[PDB]
Design a protein around this ligand. Sequence first.
Ligand SMILES: *[C@@H]1O[C@H](CO)[C@@H](O[C@@H]2O[C@H](CO)[C@@H](O[C@@H]3O[C@H](CO)[C@@H](O)[C@H](O)[C@@H]3O)[C@H](O)[C@H]2NC(C)=O)[C@H](O)[C@H]1NC(C)=O
Ligand SMILES: *[C@@H]1O[C@H](CO)[C@@H](O[C@@H]2O[C@H](CO)[C@@H](O[C@@H]3O[C@H](CO)[C@@H](O)[C@H](O)[C@@H]3O)[C@H](O)[C@H]2NC(C)=O)[C@H](O)[C@H]1NC(C)=O
Ligand SMILES: *[C@@H]1O[C@H](CO)[C@@H](O[C@@H]2O[C@H](CO)[C@@H](O)[C@H](O)[C@H]2NC(C)=O)[C@H](O)[C@H]1NC(C)=O
Ligand SMILES: *[C@@H]1O[C@H](CO)[C@@H](O)[C@H](O)[C@H]1NC(C)=O
Ligand SMILES: *[C@@H]1O[C@H](CO)[C@@H](O)[C@H](O)[C@H]1NC(C)=O
Ligand SMILES: *[C@@H]1O[C@H](CO)[C@@H](O)[C@H](O)[C@H]1NC(C)=O
Ligand SMILES: *[C@@H]1O[C@H](CO)[C@@H](O)[C@H](O)[C@H]1NC(C)=O
Ligand SMILES: *[C@@H]1O[C@H](CO)[C@@H](O)[C@H](O)[C@H]1NC(C)=O
Ligand SMILES: [Br-]
Ligand SMILES: [Br-]
Ligand SMILES: [Br-]
Ligand SMILES: [Br-]
Ligand SMILES: [Br-]
Ligand SMILES: [Br-]
Ligand SMILES: [Br-]
Lengths: 238, 214, 228
Amino acid sequence: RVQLINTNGSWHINRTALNCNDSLHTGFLAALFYTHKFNASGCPERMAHCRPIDEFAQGWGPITYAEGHGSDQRPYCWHYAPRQCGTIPASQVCGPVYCFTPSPVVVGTTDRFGAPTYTWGENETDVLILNNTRPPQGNWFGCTWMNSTGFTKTCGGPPCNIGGVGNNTLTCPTDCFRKHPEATYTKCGSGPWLTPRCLVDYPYRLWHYPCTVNFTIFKVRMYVGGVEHRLNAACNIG
Amino acid sequence: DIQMTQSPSSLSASVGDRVTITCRAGQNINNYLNWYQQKPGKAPKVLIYAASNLQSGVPSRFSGSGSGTDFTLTISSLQPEDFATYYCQQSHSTVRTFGQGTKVEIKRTVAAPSVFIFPPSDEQLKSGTASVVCLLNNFYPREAKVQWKVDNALQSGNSQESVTEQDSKDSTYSLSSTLTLSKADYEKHKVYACEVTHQGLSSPVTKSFNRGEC
Amino acid sequence: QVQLVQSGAEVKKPGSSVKVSCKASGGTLNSYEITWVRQAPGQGLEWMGGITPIFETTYAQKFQGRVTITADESTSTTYMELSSLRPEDTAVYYCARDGVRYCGGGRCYNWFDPWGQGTLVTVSSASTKGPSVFPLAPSSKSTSGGTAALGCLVKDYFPEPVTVSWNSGALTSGVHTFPAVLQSSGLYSLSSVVTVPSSSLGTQTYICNVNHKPSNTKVDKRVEPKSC
Ligand SMILES: *[C@@H]1O[C@H](CO)[C@@H](O[C@@H]2O[C@H](CO)[C@@H](O[C@@H]3O[C@H](CO)[C@@H](O)[C@H](O)[C@@H]3O)[C@H](O)[C@H]2NC(C)=O)[C@H](O)[C@H]1NC(C)=O
Ligand SMILES: *[C@@H]1O[C@H](CO)[C@@H](O[C@@H]2O[C@H](CO)[C@@H](O[C@@H]3O[C@H](CO)[C@@H](O)[C@H](O)[C@@H]3O)[C@H](O)[C@H]2NC(C)=O)[C@H](O)[C@H]1NC(C)=O
Ligand SMILES: *[C@@H]1O[C@H](CO)[C@@H](O[C@@H]2O[C@H](CO)[C@@H](O)[C@H](O)[C@H]2NC(C)=O)[C@H](O)[C@H]1NC(C)=O
Ligand SMILES: *[C@@H]1O[C@H](CO)[C@@H](O)[C@H](O)[C@H]1NC(C)=O
Ligand SMILES: *[C@@H]1O[C@H](CO)[C@@H](O)[C@H](O)[C@H]1NC(C)=O
Ligand SMILES: *[C@@H]1O[C@H](CO)[C@@H](O)[C@H](O)[C@H]1NC(C)=O
Ligand SMILES: *[C@@H]1O[C@H](CO)[C@@H](O)[C@H](O)[C@H]1NC(C)=O
Ligand SMILES: *[C@@H]1O[C@H](CO)[C@@H](O)[C@H](O)[C@H]1NC(C)=O
Ligand SMILES: [Br-]
Ligand SMILES: [Br-]
Ligand SMILES: [Br-]
Ligand SMILES: [Br-]
Ligand SMILES: [Br-]
Ligand SMILES: [Br-]
Ligand SMILES: [Br-]
């Protein structure tokens, strides 16, 4: 973070995929170097698209998992259901990839057989092996990165089916025990969103979720099948 | 600061030809080099970034190459709408430096100027100053020598030349040559002549009027 | 989607100073990588200096001490101030965005996009003055075939620029409006000529409309053939 570009012109972490291309004039790439200069005046409109959890219908019955893959949009909303993580090629990734255990961890670039590689993802065969199963058995709940053209991509889970289907159904990818008493994070968490109003704080949150510069940072406590987790969440309360 | 040298300064090329513009950097700048195109009367727009990457919307005819100190810009097959001045610019230092620029022009068949001379208007003669305008319409190439004679005396110092950019359709130029004398001197002499020498003229063409006749 | 809008043109006497503003809006930063470059008439590009989003300035070798670049994030306006103006600083001053826009091979690259519309700054002793518009009347000495040439002499004005239309805009084809030439007097001058059907001389009226906003001058000069 000290000097994002080292003395030799290159990005300071060479295990980071750095294939960025700001061809749509969104200025997401300048925000990479000046992230506290983010212009927040569009946030009230972008965040108005997300509905609070109390707007959602009560769930019931036993909980199953999400294999539908419906045309969902807007990963910046907490209720976004993602698809399960797989391997993604470095050619489409711009910046560090963080996965959430719920605690944040970075997945450097590797070759297809998992050996580490160190060329900022310029090889067309470099990948980021993000395949996830939910811990304690697995590794992490979900991941979040930025693609070349500047869109927040995210994966993980799969999310949960809490009962009902249609207009106002909540496919829970976080702790939704408000709507289903078994919809805990460990059962249903699929990434950084710890509650409908908290996401995990990590060094690039403000770049991947810039309309959360707003949020207050709370020390929170997560229990994942025994192993106690003490991590920082950025929550929207006021 | 890093000195960028461009080569050449001016270039005339036929349509469909291939044009090679060199930029040489003072020191190693790796590939931190952009190419701007500038049409006259408008701001420059980038066409190639990072030595060799074609900006969006730019025809594949343009192409950049080179790393370190020697950089070239290549237009494979020149087109009528590629007329402009082209600038290279290093982005290796925070203090940005430009090249001297390469203006490119459409070569075409030699064309001869039509020469017209206008005596000064009666209104301007009333003001005390007299301007004689000699006009060369629609010629190529640009090089043209205009020489005013007044009562067979060769003028010097009292005339100013102005030339248009290439014409969009026919690629020709037009020039004006304005000779400026005081009313007292203009009313003194009789024969105002404008002698034009141009490659497309077999002889130097001379346009002449006698003061006071219409 | 960001837009840079520079201030209007400026006329300054030698020795004084000018402050060109460049306001950015409609983007994803509150302050931008703002860079400055000028270009004298007919001349090449000259880089002057830039300022980072966190307001760190860099300047070129030949302008330091003379140029100062400031910012104001409330209006997202960048300012460029050049002092000890000389005749040779007559130029069009551009501001542009020099932000990062491509990263590859572990390196990231900046270039100028978008650009502002420009600011003309003239540095002379002259004082604002409107043009004298004289006809260049058609004659036998300007016919050549079925055509005939006529025009307007636009003389002794300052500063730039002038616009010149014909028949209020109804005549646009076959027009050559020559680039202005700075006269020794310090006043500019150009000529605007048009070619027309010679069989229209005497029945079709030709008027050139010369406008010079710096002096609130609008001239309509009738161009009629020499009749004697
Ligand atoms: C970076 O992420 C964005 C958003 O995920 C990517 O844009 C998306 O690209 C896909 C694949 O082309 C688009 O889906 C396709 O749309 C076309 C119609 O345009 C349709 O005919 C296809 O059947 C398919 O559904 C998707 O619409 C598009 N979404 C957005 C918001 O632009 C972008 O491609 C990614 N860039 C890179 C370099 O990976
Ligand atoms: C950054 O993104 C831009 C825009 O998406 C990339 O530009 C694209 O570059 C490809 C290179 O092959 C162009 O393909 C070419 O298409 C033309 C037809 O116009 C064809 O004649 C060529 O043989 C080639 O197939 C593509 O047109 C171009 N897209 C646009 C709309 O500009 C750019 O490559 C990306 N930058 C980097 C360094 O990856
Ligand atoms: C910060 O973002 C806001 C929201 O997009 C921008 O506000 C818009 O600006 C454009 C251009 O000035 C106007 O036409 C819109 O009407 C504005 N809309 C709103 C929501 O007010 C603002 O310009 C951006 N600011 C900066 C510093 O670039
Ligand atoms: C420094 O940059 C040069 C030029 O790109 C490169 O050859 C060299 O390998 C780099 N230094 C390192 C990290 O070895
Ligand atoms: C970059 O990779 C090289 C070679 O694998 C390694 O020596 C270097 O330490 C890496 N970058 C940093 C700053 O650690
Ligand atoms: C964040 O901004 C949103 C949209 O303007 C608003 O709904 C929310 O209350 C803000 N968060 C705070 C101040 O806690
Ligand atoms: C990981 O995901 C990739 C891409 O979907 C897939 O090819 C690979 O088989 C997966 N590996 C495991 C062990 O899940
Ligand atoms: C790309 O990866 C392959 C296989 O790991 C390797 O042999 C090759 O040298 C790499 N090339 C580059 C450009 O790093
Ligand atoms: Br932009
Ligand atoms: Br910052
Ligand atoms: Br698979
Ligand atoms: Br967001
Ligand atoms: Br040098
Ligand atoms: Br320069
Ligand atoms: Br910027």
